[PDB]
Amino acid sequence: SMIEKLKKFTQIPGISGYEERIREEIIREIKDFADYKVDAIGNLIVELGEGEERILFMAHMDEIGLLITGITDEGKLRFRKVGGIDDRLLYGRHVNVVTEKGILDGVIGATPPHLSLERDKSVIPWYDLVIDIGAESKEEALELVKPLDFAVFKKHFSVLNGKYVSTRGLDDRFGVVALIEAIKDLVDHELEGKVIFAFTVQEEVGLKGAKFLANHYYPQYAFAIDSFACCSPLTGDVKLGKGPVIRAVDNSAIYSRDLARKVWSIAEKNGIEIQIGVTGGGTDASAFQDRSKTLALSVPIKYLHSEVETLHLNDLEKLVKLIEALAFEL
């Protein structure tokens, strides 16, 4: 119910711009506790209580996938990348081409095997690849897919020891999950200031979902719950299963230091093993230091942004257990 909750949300396709299938399902499991409104741009916003705008929580729906840019003469699909993938993760891998008519499966096979003796033994760049969907010609392809349909990897699900979980799309699905688990566990409790949960769009392509929020939402403290890339010197003693991490500093922003304490305190004062770190990249929260106390805490992750992303199942536990015990005790 934590797993299958997770299996349920990684499986949903939807990269930046195209988050529909994800937020429709968030609404399936939210409809009947709390009350939503949907941004223009796309954002699920869900206030709790009324009054001055206190905390804001953001996990983003969109993920990294491929935009279909056009079609070849023999009906293979061209694509650009949306977000940040690594090409070696593109070569010879099933995908899942999402269209209007609905899901449709193909394969970025392109794998000239052992017996061709022009050995392309370097990594083959994202633009030399195409998707196979079994189309016979340029025409037959359009029967099935049009430009600006997008696609995503057929995602395996794996539970490693008993503790960990691997699949592509933890960034930031787990987060979307958390802010649901951690919203059912609120509301009827009510004793508050006034906290705003949000499910952002287009984070992986420039945070644009949260840059849109930054209007109408001037809160006091704005959090992001995205991933925390793990296990490099520069990650200090962060290791997996030693509880949620506070992105103190990344590449998008170095974050409020007093806010850091204010949670770190609530942390130990509340029986939790929060840990602290310095990584790379950025987080929706860093769209708010514009004017706002920002910080984003997260779960440390291995093999990030690959279909092998691996979060520890306890940290997730403790992290909702904290990003709740924040919305009160702050």
Tell me if residue 248 falls in helix, strand or coil. strand
Nearer to a copy of itself by C-beta: 133 or 195? 133
DSSP of 137-200: SHHHHHTT--TT-EEEEPPP-EE-SSSEEE-TTHHHHHHHHHHHHHHHSSGGG--SS-EEEEEE
Any known ligand binding at 60? yes
From the list Co ion, a copy of itself, none, partner contacted by residue 194 (C-beta under 5 to 8 A by kind): none
| Site map (CB under 8 A) of a copy of itself, residues 95-134, x = contact | ----------xxxxxxxxxxxx----xxxx--x----xxx
Residue 305 assigned ligand-binding role: yes
Beta-ladder partners of 296:
224, 247
- Residue 186: CB atoms within 10 A of its CB come to 20
Catalytic residue, chosen from 19, 47, 203, 324, is 203
Question: Which two structure tokens, joined as six digits, stand for 311?
Answer: 């979060």
Token digits of residue 47: 């206030």
Site for Co ion in 208-227 (CB under 5 A): 226
Residues of this chain, 220-279, that bind Co ion according to CB under 5 A: 226
Report yes or no: 60 and 52 within 8 Å, Cβ to Cβ: no
The answer to whether 203 is a known catalytic residue is yes
* Phi, psi of 168, deg, nearest 5: -85, 115
> Which among 2-10, 75-83, 186-194, 317-325 is the span making contact with a copy of itself, rule CB under 8 A?
75-83
For helices 170-184 and 313-320, the axis angle rounded to 10 degrees is 40
Site string for a copy of itself, 182-221 (x = CB under 8 A): --------------------x--xx-x--xx--x------
Per-residue mark of binding to Co ion, 172-201 (x: CB under 5 A): x-----------------------------
Q: Which residues are the active-site residues?
A: 203
Q: For binding to Co ion (CB under 5 A), which residues are involved?
A: 171-172, 226
